[PDB]
Design a protein around this ligand. Structure first.
Ligand SMILES: C=CC1=C(C)c2cc3[nH]c(cc4nc(cc5[nH]c(cc1n2)c(C)c5C=C)C(C)=C4CCC(=O)O)c(CCC(=O)O)c3C
Ligand SMILES: C=CC1=C(C)c2cc3[nH]c(cc4nc(cc5[nH]c(cc1n2)c(C)c5C=C)C(C)=C4CCC(=O)O)c(CCC(=O)O)c3C
Ligand SMILES: C[C@H](CCC(=O)O)[C@H]1CC[C@H]2[C@@H]3[C@H](O)C[C@@H]4C[C@H](O)CC[C@]4(C)[C@H]3C[C@H](O)[C@]12C
Ligand SMILES: C[C@H](CCC(=O)O)[C@H]1CC[C@H]2[C@@H]3[C@H](O)C[C@@H]4C[C@H](O)CC[C@]4(C)[C@H]3C[C@H](O)[C@]12C
Ligand SMILES: C[C@H](CCC(=O)O)[C@H]1CC[C@H]2[C@@H]3[C@H](O)C[C@@H]4C[C@H](O)CC[C@]4(C)[C@H]3C[C@H](O)[C@]12C
Ligand SMILES: C[C@H](CCC(=O)O)[C@H]1CC[C@H]2[C@@H]3[C@H](O)C[C@@H]4C[C@H](O)CC[C@]4(C)[C@H]3C[C@H](O)[C@]12C
Ligand code: FES
Ligand code: FES
Ligand SMILES: [Pb+2]
Lengths: 359, 359
């Protein structure tokens, strides 16, 4: 039967092949919800083209691109499967991929959700932890869309804007951590340092009140609680781009910092992005790792597998949608509140949109 | 009879009267574990005098001094009583007050714990969330004491170095929040914004890897989980002293930021310090509260009361010591791991000291 309940899966998406890099960077640096530059429509095209080469190299270092589109579909298909059996009253359920910087674009998925004549549309963020630069932008995209077309929705919108401590998300992290630990020498297992690595945020964003850091910290605690604190752990922030100040200990300097101090068995954990992505300096660059071993004696730096296609993740997705439908909520209580120092007119307009939806 | 189990309650302490302010700051600015200044033994004395007036004024604004000594005693007495019934095998128990910058000083309490011939001494930090500047300093003080007195322990030490998510602690917070919410007009209650306010940390401390922020974040999530996200919330960092950069949104700015954005009913929650301390700029200064009420229409700003003398707190303190003894652990797994960017050699010595304790 015709599709009743649509499920828009929001994520920034990623460049499918090295060829898509430029179009990805382009839309990203044009995102006024992610950032703001002086002349914007002019230097954005440049900045993209400019550093497009080094980003292409980075993606080449991990397989030649991002597998998010494939992975997201598998999970989407696995989620829909369970939704039909979980909540028949809202079936048939259909998932749509709403990527922010690559096809299928958010706006592209919305237009199809419309054309398909759905009764209930659910903006389901794929970032467990809320940041105004990730979920906020994907959510502002939906808003901006209708404000553009000029027209109003033809279906009821609602949203699952965050889920940093969902019990199944936590069980997945716990499972994957235990799996890697077993890849460490039997007698080293106990002294392995778990470094939860999440993407950093510029301090100016943190200081305006972004909820992201506190949420990621929450996810980390649930995980360790579940693992019964079997090992020591630390939450560090990876990558970080630019000369300006970014949050907490950088993942790079924390790894080096840890080896110069006796901890040689490190287990990195991607706690804030569910799909494979660009790794850290000590994982990609060899000379820097060569020095780290000749000067600190680093013996093991492992990475827990991304939630990728774990069957228990789909179950996590389906459960969230199900509770959502049950609860009748339009959005979390946290979305009804903008950053204490929020300076984006759009933000408040997006709040209204979801809290003002029919039913 | 003779006291079998001793319990050292660690905390920075506070000047009981305006007269004690000077020696308080003195010992504080002299704490190399808290901060490092050039020719510190010559600067601390100066900074103390140069700041004492400002602080006396602040303590006056809240009653004339700090009530931590009395409150810690009441909780101490109430902790002991519950321990003699809970742990008959380690009873009788005796609590000792080890304040870092005021009498009874940490060293004074240690020196008395031995004289009483204790079989087991427990360093129990009163800060639920671990920071190297609070719990770390209190713990490095115990180690520094034996490295000074030359001799070694006559009792078997162990420590409860953190407890950010202890269910009873979380329950006390959830109870005090519900109670303040009931002071707001029945119809504005759902609009109240919960501002969890914790003492900020210098960004240089956050970046070296202090666990404090992540743990404080955990406390916050457990509390809102318990209250079922009844209201929207934010974790902001208060006080913040100096010119350099300190962490996340500042309490003063967020309050103003929140009012400038239509949020008039705010509820402040002291999530990282269990006793009364210096309030924020908008709770003290009259002119600032005036400027705010005019340009924002701030209806009500309330502060949840400190855990202070809640009996459910003593039940919390007691439950922890009991579990600690039953678990037969010497310290948390987190203590065995230093900051990835740590540069205080004492840290490592304090670690060894506790993990190397007999039994
Ligand atoms: C406002 C704050 C943020 C800014 C300005 C930001 C900027 C960027 N983020 C990028 C990529 C990326 N960022 C990413 C996840 C996040 N990024 C985040 C927050 C920000 N990310 C948060 C929060 C994330 C959550 C999970 C991912 C997954 C990529 C794609 C590349 C890679 O590093 O995996 C790129 C393009 C690649 C590069 O090396 O230039 C920029 C300019
Ligand atoms: C390394 C990081 C830290 C520095 C440099 C720091 C510095 C200070 N902290 C003070 C007082 C204080 N700090 C306090 C809780 C904390 N302080 C903390 C971390 C730090 N605190 C953390 C973490 C806390 C919470 C658990 C309290 C309760 C006081 C006493 C007065 C007040 O703000 O109530 C004073 C004395 C008042 C003044 O302005 O001279 C200084 C200089
Ligand atoms: C002046 C402005 C800062 C605005 C702000 O934060 O308030 C900054 C932000 C982005 C910067 C630009 C980007 O870093 C891209 C270029 C980097 C080159 O090294 C200099 C020119 C370059 C084109 C920069 C010019 C200038 O420093 C910019 C435009
Ligand atoms: C990542 C990119 C290039 C730096 C690099 O070569 O790694 C830099 C250049 C322009 C930078 C942005 C501009 O300086 C404008 C903003 C300044 C704010 O303090 C942080 C976010 C902010 C939106 C910056 C994010 C990031 O640092 C940018 C986008
Ligand atoms: C030079 C040194 C920085 C060393 C460091 O941490 O890297 C800084 C840190 C603390 C500073 C001092 C403190 O801020 C206290 C005083 C503040 C006064 O405004 C100037 C002198 C004053 C006595 C400062 C002198 C100098 O700027 C100090 C000593
Ligand atoms: C705020 C206070 C007094 C300065 C003043 O007289 O106005 C100053 C004196 C000593 C300073 C501290 C010391 O310089 C040691 C640290 C130096 C780091 O770069 C920042 C945090 C750091 C922990 C400083 C925080 C703050 O600037 C202090 C605590
Ligand atoms: S930037 Fe966070 S609500 Fe607007
Ligand atoms: S400063 Fe944190 S372990 Fe030394
Ligand atoms: Pb302080």
């Amino acid at each position: 039967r015709k599709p009743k309940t649509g499920i828009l899966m929001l994520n920034m998406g990623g460049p499918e092949t090295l060829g898509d890099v430029h179009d990805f960077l382009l839309r990203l640096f044009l995102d006024r919800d992610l950032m703001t530059l002086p002349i914007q429509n002019k230097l954005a095209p440049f900045i993209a083209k400019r550093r497009t080469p080094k980003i292409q190299e980075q993606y080449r270092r991990i397989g030649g691109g991002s597998p998010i589109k494939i992975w997201t579909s598998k999970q989407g298909e696995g989620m829909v499967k369970l939704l039909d059996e979980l909540s028949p009253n809202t079936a048939p359920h259909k998932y749509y991929i709403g990527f922010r910087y690559v096809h299928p674009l958010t706006e592209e998925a919305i237009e199809e959700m419309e054309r398909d004549g759905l009764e209930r549309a659910i903006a389901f963020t794929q970032y467990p932890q809320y940041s105004c630069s990730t979920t906020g932008s994907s959510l502002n995209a939906i808003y901006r869309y209708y404000n553009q077309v000029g027209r109003k929705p033809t279906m009821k919108w609602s949203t699952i804007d965050r889920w940093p401590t969902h019990h199944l998300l936590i069980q997945c992290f716990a499972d994957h951590i235990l799996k890697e630990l077993d890849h460490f020498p039997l007698e080293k297992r106990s002294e392995v340092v778990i470094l939860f690595s999440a993407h950093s945020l510029p301090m100016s964003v943190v200081n305006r009140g972004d909820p992201y850091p506190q949420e990621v910290s929450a996810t980390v605690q649930k995980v360790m609680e579940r693992l019964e604190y079997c090992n020591p752990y630390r939450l560090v922030w990876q990558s970080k781009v630019g000369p300006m100040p970014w949050l907490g200990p950088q993942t790079d300097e924390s790894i080096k910092g840890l080896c110069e101090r006796g901890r040689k068995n490190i287990l990195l954990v991607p706690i804030a992005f569910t799909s494979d992505h660009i790794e850290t300096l000590y994982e990609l660059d060899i000379e820097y790792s060569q020095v780290l071993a000749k000067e600190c004696g680093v013996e093991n730096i492992r990475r827990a597998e991304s939630l990728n296609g774990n069957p228990l993740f789909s179950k996590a997705l389906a459960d969230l949608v199900h509770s959502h439908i049950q609860s009748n909520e339009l959005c979390s209580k946290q979305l009804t509140l903008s950053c204490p120092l929020c300076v984006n007119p759009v933000c408040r307009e997006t709040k209204s949109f979801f809290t003002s939806q029919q039913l």
